[PDB]
Design an enzyme around this catalytic site. Structure first.
Site, PDB file in Angstrom:
ATOM      1  N   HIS A  44       8.038  -4.397  -2.177  1.00 28.09           N
ATOM      2  CA  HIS A  44       8.107  -4.905  -3.560  1.00 28.09           C
ATOM      3  C   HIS A  44       8.975  -4.008  -4.462  1.00 28.09           C
ATOM      4  O   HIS A  44       9.402  -4.420  -5.530  1.00 28.09           O
ATOM      5  CB  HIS A  44       6.711  -5.160  -4.157  1.00 28.09           C
ATOM      6  CG  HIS A  44       6.059  -3.947  -4.743  1.00 28.09           C
ATOM      7  ND1 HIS A  44       5.098  -3.218  -4.073  1.00 28.09           N
ATOM      8  CD2 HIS A  44       6.225  -3.345  -5.945  1.00 28.09           C
ATOM      9  CE1 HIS A  44       4.713  -2.211  -4.834  1.00 28.09           C
ATOM     10  NE2 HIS A  44       5.373  -2.276  -5.982  1.00 28.09           N
ATOM     11  N   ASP A  91       3.948  -5.554   2.715  1.00 23.87           N
ATOM     12  CA  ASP A  91       4.588  -4.818   1.634  1.00 23.87           C
ATOM     13  C   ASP A  91       5.122  -3.468   2.149  1.00 23.87           C
ATOM     14  O   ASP A  91       4.536  -2.403   1.942  1.00 23.87           O
ATOM     15  CB  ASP A  91       3.668  -4.676   0.416  1.00 23.87           C
ATOM     16  CG  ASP A  91       4.403  -4.156  -0.832  1.00 23.87           C
ATOM     17  OD1 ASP A  91       5.652  -4.075  -0.825  1.00 23.87           O
ATOM     18  OD2 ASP A  91       3.731  -3.765  -1.816  1.00 23.87           O
ATOM     19  N   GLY A 192       4.597   3.108 -10.450  1.00 24.14           N
ATOM     20  CA  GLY A 192       5.556   4.218 -10.341  1.00 24.14           C
ATOM     21  C   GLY A 192       5.292   5.046  -9.095  1.00 24.14           C
ATOM     22  O   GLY A 192       6.181   5.770  -8.622  1.00 24.14           O
ATOM     23  N   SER A 194       4.151   3.332  -6.412  1.00 26.95           N
ATOM     24  CA  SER A 194       4.428   2.309  -5.405  1.00 26.95           C
ATOM     25  C   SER A 194       5.486   2.751  -4.439  1.00 26.95           C
ATOM     26  O   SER A 194       6.493   3.371  -4.845  1.00 26.95           O
ATOM     27  CB  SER A 194       4.871   1.019  -6.065  1.00 26.95           C
ATOM     28  OG  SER A 194       3.827   0.475  -6.823  1.00 26.95           O
ATOM     29  N   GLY A 195       5.250   2.441  -3.168  1.00 26.30           N
ATOM     30  CA  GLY A 195       6.182   2.805  -2.100  1.00 26.30           C
ATOM     31  C   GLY A 195       5.971   4.186  -1.505  1.00 26.30           C
ATOM     32  O   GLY A 195       6.459   4.468  -0.408  1.00 26.30           O
TER      33      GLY A 195
HETATM   34  N1  5TA Z   1      -4.072   1.397  -8.561  1.00 25.47           N
HETATM   35  C1  5TA Z   1      -3.202   1.021  -7.407  1.00 25.47           C
HETATM   36  C2  5TA Z   1      -1.825   0.534  -7.799  1.00 25.47           C
HETATM   37  C3  5TA Z   1      -0.692   1.266  -7.430  1.00 25.47           C
HETATM   38  C4  5TA Z   1       0.614   0.836  -7.748  1.00 25.47           C
HETATM   39  C5  5TA Z   1       0.826  -0.353  -8.456  1.00 25.47           C
HETATM   40  C6  5TA Z   1      -0.326  -1.078  -8.825  1.00 25.47           C
HETATM   41  O1  5TA Z   1      -0.256  -2.283  -9.503  1.00 25.47           O
HETATM   42  C7  5TA Z   1       1.019  -2.862  -9.757  1.00 25.47           C
HETATM   43  C8  5TA Z   1       0.817  -4.375  -9.938  1.00 25.47           C
HETATM   44  C9  5TA Z   1      -0.125  -4.814 -11.087  1.00 25.47           C
HETATM   45  N2  5TA Z   1      -1.029  -5.760 -10.398  1.00 25.47           N
HETATM   46  C10 5TA Z   1      -2.140  -6.471 -11.015  1.00 25.47           C
HETATM   47  C11 5TA Z   1      -2.228  -6.499 -12.416  1.00 25.47           C
HETATM   48  C12 5TA Z   1      -3.305  -7.151 -13.031  1.00 25.47           C
HETATM   49  C13 5TA Z   1      -4.287  -7.778 -12.254  1.00 25.47           C
HETATM   50  C14 5TA Z   1      -4.210  -7.748 -10.850  1.00 25.47           C
HETATM   51  C15 5TA Z   1      -5.258  -8.394 -10.075  1.00 25.47           C
HETATM   52  C16 5TA Z   1      -6.139  -8.933  -9.438  1.00 25.47           C
HETATM   53  C17 5TA Z   1      -7.235  -9.556  -8.727  1.00 25.47           C
HETATM   54  C18 5TA Z   1      -8.537  -9.286  -9.142  1.00 25.47           C
HETATM   55  C19 5TA Z   1      -9.612  -9.871  -8.460  1.00 25.47           C
HETATM   56  C20 5TA Z   1      -9.324 -10.694  -7.364  1.00 25.47           C
HETATM   57  N3  5TA Z   1      -8.081 -10.949  -6.934  1.00 25.47           N
HETATM   58  C21 5TA Z   1      -7.063 -10.376  -7.597  1.00 25.47           C
HETATM   59 CL1  5TA Z   1      -5.397 -10.711  -6.953  1.00 25.47          CL
HETATM   60  C22 5TA Z   1      -3.134  -7.092 -10.218  1.00 25.47           C
HETATM   61  C23 5TA Z   1      -0.722  -5.799  -9.017  1.00 25.47           C
HETATM   62  O2  5TA Z   1      -1.334  -6.466  -8.175  1.00 25.47           O
HETATM   63  O3  5TA Z   1       0.340  -4.982  -8.735  1.00 25.47           O
HETATM   64  C24 5TA Z   1      -1.636  -0.647  -8.511  1.00 25.47           C
END
Ligand code: 5TA
Length: 242
Positions: A44, A91, A192, A194-195
């Protein structure tokens, strides 16, 4: 990185920073050096759309972003063909550098796990990066590399968590078998990061268990961080990396 601390200079010699061209070559994702000529990262960070290679550089381990950059161009970006969104999975991506780098105690590769290693709860594991230090809170200057020890949560327990406070039916699997969970409300990776690598010490050797992939925000209740499970992609990686 949410929680944890600045990394000592001798640690995480495989950590890399991915840079996008603009007013300056800005950090946007992590990666890890897995071969002198290859960087492992998250799909991603570089897909699913094909972008111009000229607009990407790799920076090898440095203690502070931007101060003494030596940016490296990339000859190829290989993205797992199953990839289209992080929530679905696959991913994972590889970047081939135009030259192989020289290695030392300060900059060298990380070891990939054997196909069989499961990384169970209680294993000592660390995630590292220059990403956000909290939700919508960037790492302040001077941008030190950060580290945090994160607790692994078994996939099924992580999946159950992700269903709490959600409409999704319990039998619809959110946290998939090619993924892995770690972190809690005090310790996590963040945008930030990520990866970048999640590494676990196993019989005295650091193995890369995960690639920082997604989650609902950072350090949120019932929402552990979600990583691409490296063991699932070993055959694919070995198709390209010697
Ligand atoms: N903390 C680790 C980490 C590291 C690096 C980047 C990260 O996030 C980057 C983006 C932001 N985002 C995101 C934003 C808002 C809501 C949701 C959700 C949900 C949900 C809840 C319940 C059931 N099913 C689901 Cl799909 C997912 C995501 O998925 O990727 C996270």
């Amino acid at each position: 990185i949410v929680g944890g601390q600045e990394a000592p200079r001798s640690k995480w010699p495989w950590q890399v920073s991915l840079r996008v061209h603009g007013p300056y070559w800005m950090h946007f994702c992590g990666g890890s050096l897995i071969h002198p000529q290859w960087v492992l990262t998250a799909a991603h960070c570089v897909g699913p759309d094909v972008k111009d290679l000229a607009a990407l550089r790799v920076q090898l381990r440095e203690q502070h972003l931007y101060y003494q950059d030596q940016l490296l161009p990339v000859s190829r970006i290989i993205v797992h063909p199953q990839f289209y969104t992080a929530q679905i999975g696959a991913d994972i991506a590889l970047l081939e550098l135009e030259e192989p780098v020289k290695v030392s105690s300060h900059v060298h590769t990380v070891t990939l796990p054997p196909a069989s290693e499961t990384f169970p709860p209680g294993m000592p594991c660390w995630v590292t990066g220059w990403g956000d230090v909290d939700n919508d809170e960037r790492l302040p200057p001077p941008f030190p590399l950060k580290q945090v020890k994160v607790p692994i949560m078994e996939n099924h327990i992580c999946d159950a968590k992700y269903h709490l406070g959600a409409y999704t039916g319990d039998d619809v699997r959110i946290v998939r078998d090619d993924m892995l969970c770690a972190g809690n409300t005090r310790r996590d990776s963040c945008q930030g990061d990520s990866g970048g690598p999640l590494v676990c010490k196993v019989n005295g050797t650091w193995l890369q268990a995960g690639v920082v992939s997604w989650g609902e925000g950072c350090a949120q209740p019932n929402r552990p961080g979600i990583y691409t499970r490296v063991t699932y992609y070993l055959d694919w990686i070995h198709h390209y990396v010697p």
